[PDB]
């Protein structure tokens, strides 16, 4: 609902640590993968499965056990410089490749 952070900088510099965004999960009971997530920069709102990556700001929720956290990453938030740096833009463009034919 707010805009997506674009830059280089983190829009949340205290999540910046796998360790930090591993503690807001606690006892996860969701179908994904809470190291997964924090891997793919994400951390835990403590409302149902909500996320929100600590660089773009970006949040996501209703996982299912087929969804990739860095696949819904570069899904629904292009624009991080986060999951470029962590993924490289040949990955993001396969995957939007893909998400765009799924649709058919
Ligand atoms: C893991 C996937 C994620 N999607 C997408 C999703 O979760 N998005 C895409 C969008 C950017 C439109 C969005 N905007 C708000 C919220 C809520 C929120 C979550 C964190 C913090 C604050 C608010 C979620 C969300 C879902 C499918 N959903 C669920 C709601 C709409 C949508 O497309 C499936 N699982
Ligand atoms: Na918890
Ligand atoms: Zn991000």
């Known amino acids: 609902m707010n805009f997506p952070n674009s830059t280089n900088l983190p829009r949340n510099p205290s999540m910046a640590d796998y360790e930090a965004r591993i503690f807001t999960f606690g006892t996860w009971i969701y179908s994904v ?4 997530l924090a891997r793919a920069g994400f951390y835990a709102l403590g409302e149902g499965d909500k996320v929100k990556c600590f660089h773009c700001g970006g949040g996501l929720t209703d996982w299912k056990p087929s969804e990739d956290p860095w696949e819904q ?3 629904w938030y292009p624009g991080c410089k986060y999951l470029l740096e962590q993924k490289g833009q040949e990955y993001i463009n396969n995957i939007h490749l893909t998400h765009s034919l799924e649709e058919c």
């Open 33 to 36: 993968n809470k190291e997964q």
């Open 73 to 75: 990453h570069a899904k």
